[PDB]
Amino acid sequence: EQEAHNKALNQFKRKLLEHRRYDDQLKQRRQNIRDLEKLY
Amino acid sequence: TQELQTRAKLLDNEIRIFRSELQRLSHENNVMLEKIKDNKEKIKNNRQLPYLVANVVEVMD
């Protein structure tokens, strides 16, 4: 509440939720390049 | 507060690696789907019927 260090940590918890959203995409798109590279 | 400040200083650089790496994989994964359609048009031309029969007397292996 009073502290201005809680406003600093809220900006980086929106980037941390984006890092969880990005992990599901990156690991799924990387496994699709490994399957298609054995066919290739 | 020192432990939480060091988590915050690291994520200023980190969101740049994730953005640059999702763009690399999505353009590479568009090129892998086009490779397997292009080579398959040339396999299907050679697979054309008719074609002789044989058997394999030996695999040298």
Side-chain angles (χ1 to χ4, degrees):
Chain A
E1 309 308 327
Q2 298 182 101
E3 296 187 282
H5 182 66
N6 171 34
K7 296 160 182 172
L9 287 172
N10 293 343
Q11 165 183 308
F12 292 105
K13 178 55 182 192
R14 292 297 170 272
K15 288 187 187 183
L16 190 73
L17 295 168
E18 186 76 291
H19 289 139
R20 301 186 174 190
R21 193 201 92 171
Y22 287 157
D23 272 355
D24 315 320
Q25 313 196 72
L26 291 167
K27 275 58 175 170
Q28 192 183 129
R29 293 179 166 281
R30 184 187 67 187
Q31 196 69 243
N32 301 132
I33 293 169
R34 290 178 175 177
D35 292 296
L36 295 167
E37 169 176 282
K38 297 183 185 67
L39 277 144
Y40 177 64
Chain B
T1 181
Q2 187 66 83
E3 177 181 356
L4 296 174
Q5 288 174 43
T6 294
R7 303 179 170 177
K9 290 179 180 180
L10 175 60
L11 291 159
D12 288 283
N13 302 315
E14 198 188 296
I15 197 66
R16 165 175 55 179
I17 293 169
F18 278 70
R19 291 177 176 177
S20 307
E21 196 180 339
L22 181 68
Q23 301 177 85
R24 176 184 77 169
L25 295 183
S26 170
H27 181 61
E28 179 73 62
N29 193 249
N30 293 332
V31 169
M32 298 309 301
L33 311 163
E34 189 52 51
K35 282 167 179 175
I36 66 171
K37 276 291 157 294
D38 179 87
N39 278 333
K40 184 62 181 74
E41 187 63 277
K42 305 177 277 187
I43 294 169
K44 187 176 206 178
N45 297 347
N46 174 242
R47 287 177 51 71
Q48 73 180 249
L49 283 62
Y51 40 92
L52 181 67
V53 165
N55 50 267
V56 189
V57 169
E58 193 179 82
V59 273
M60 295 293 285
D61 215 90

